[PDB]
């Protein structure tokens, strides 16, 4: 995959790293919300009222 080992792809990554990080947070928040992890929801100020 040396085709992608170039300066442009390094720049391309930096442009999309913030976006990928944001989508990762959506997945993290979604997983915690859907599964009611409660390892993480205990820290959340208002959600921790439940359980």
């Amino acid at each position: 995959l040396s085709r992608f080992l170039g300066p442009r792809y390094r720049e391309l990554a930096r442009n999309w790293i913030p976006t990928a990080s944001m989508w990762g947070a959506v997945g993290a928040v979604g997983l915690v919300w859907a599964t009611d992890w409660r390892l993480i929801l205990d820290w959340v100020p208002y959600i921790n009222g439940k359980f």
Binding site: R8, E11, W16
Partner: protein, 435 residues
């Protein structure tokens, strides 16, 4: 000499002002020939629905005769000198210029004054020009690009003067009388709203004293951009024309510099281009490879406080959709992922366009007049190069996001445009879910 040294050696534009407000500008270049013209800050956007064709009508009969050179005499005089007399009028500016030997600078200037101030509108001449203009409209219909751009202006700036075409409605042309044209000339052809520009063999002092001799005897609404579409479905036409734009910046907005660079990245293509599939522009390469487009081009049409920023393409019946897709995708790339190498290429393209467009006395005069009308000053090529050098990938991404990403566009279609995507689909294409 290097490129920077060559830029710094470009002769500067000398600007003076008459006592009545006329701005006299010149760029001497030591040539046997010279262009001298008058650029008036009058056009379609200064007209209402009652006289929407006044400016074009006046331009049509500007050379047909004056109070001092009745009938064809004026023309003969110009033709006697070997000078070429030309004129145009856009939605925002009017211009009457003469290309002539520098030795013929005085007479030419005199003629221009006579054309601007002492214009004689003979009633028979007015009727002749009315018939000519009606036939000109019937011929203008044949020109598809002009029709599609007029549709784009009408839909984008609907309810505002910018929606009005330069020529105006045929009914308006028929109604226009000598009184309307005289009133339009008296209101708009005023010294503070005109610039006398010259380039070539002219000397600034000579031009200034000539202007003081002839032009001394002279008189002392932010438009709303609307995302909409006009579809003129006509399956009989061989090809479909599409023009899609978004609200752009004004003349004075700095963002014009990076945006042009952005357009330079998108580029232009035509079926007669020899670059083919190897074109640097990804959209141009795709269009050449897939035969998606006969010709496409990005445009940045700026006005005083607004503008149209987008593209226009000619496509087959079954290709429009695809082309639009790729076009929009290109925009999105610039809004989200623009790299340094392509930005450098676009900057080089813009530098070449700027330096190349200013080759010739007539282009330099047009640049001087238009710059004085719009910017109020002549921007030297050194300043343009500095502004271009300020542009990088981050600036391009930011400006494209400001003007392109998630914006309502104005679309004009013409011909077999059944495949032209619905406006909801185009609007959805104006943003990326991944981003």
């Amino acid at each position: 000499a290097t490129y920077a040294q060559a830029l710094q050696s470009v002769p500067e534009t000398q600007v003076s002002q008459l006592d009545n407000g006329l701005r006299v500008a010149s760029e001497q270049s030591s040539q046997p020939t010279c262009t001298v013209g008058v650029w008036i800050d009058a056009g379609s956007r200064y007209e209402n629905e009652k006289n929407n064709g006044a400016g074009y009508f006046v331009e049509h009969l500007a050379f047909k005769g004056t109070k001092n050179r009745p009938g064809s005499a004026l023309e003969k005089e110009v033709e006697s000198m070997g000078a070429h007399l030309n004129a145009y009028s856009t939605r925002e500016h009017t211009a009457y210029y003469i290309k002539a030997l520098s030795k013929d600078l005085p007479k030419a200037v005199e003629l221009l004054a006579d054309i601007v101030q002492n214009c004689s509108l003979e009633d028979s001449q007015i009727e002749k020009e009315r018939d000519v203009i009606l036939q000109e409209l019937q011929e203008n219909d044949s020109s598809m690009r002009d029709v599609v751009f007029d549709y784009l202006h009408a839909t984008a700036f609907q309810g505002t003067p910018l929606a009005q075409s330069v020529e105006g409605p045929s009914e308006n042309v028929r109604k226009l009388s000598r009184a309307d044209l005289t009133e339009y000339v008296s209101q708009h052809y005023k010294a503070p709203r005109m610039v006398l520009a010259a380039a070539g063999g002219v000397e600034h002092r000579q031009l200034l004293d000539l202007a003081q001799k002839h032009f001394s005897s002279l008189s002392g609404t932010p438009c709303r951009f609307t995302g909409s579409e006009i579809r003129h479905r006509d399956d009989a036409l061989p090809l479909a024309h599409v023009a899609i734009a978004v609200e752009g910046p004004g003349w004075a907005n700095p963002d014009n510099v990076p945006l042009q660079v952005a357009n330079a990245i998108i580029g232009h293509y035509d079926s007669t281009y020899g670059g083919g599939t190897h074109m640097s522009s990804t959209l141009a390469s795709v269009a050449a490879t897939r035969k998606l487009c006969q010709s496409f081009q990005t445009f940045n049409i700026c006005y005083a406080e607004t503008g149209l920023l987008g593209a226009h393409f000619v496509c087959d019946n079954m290709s429009i959709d695809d082309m639009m897709f790729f076009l929009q995708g290109q925009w999105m790339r610039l809004c989200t992922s623009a790299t340094e190498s392509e930005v450098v290429r676009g900057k080089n393209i813009l530098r070449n366009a700027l330096v190349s467009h200013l080759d010739g006395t007539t282009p330099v005069c047009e640049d001087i007049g238009r710059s004085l009308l719009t910017y109020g000053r002549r921007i030297p090529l050194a300043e343009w190069e500095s502004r271009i050098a300020e542009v990088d990938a981050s600036v391009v991404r930011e400006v494209c996001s400001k003007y392109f990403y998630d914006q309502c566009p104005a679309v004009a279609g013409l011909g077999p445009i059944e495949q032209l995507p619905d406006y909801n689909r185009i609007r959805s294409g104006m943003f990326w879910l991944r981003f």
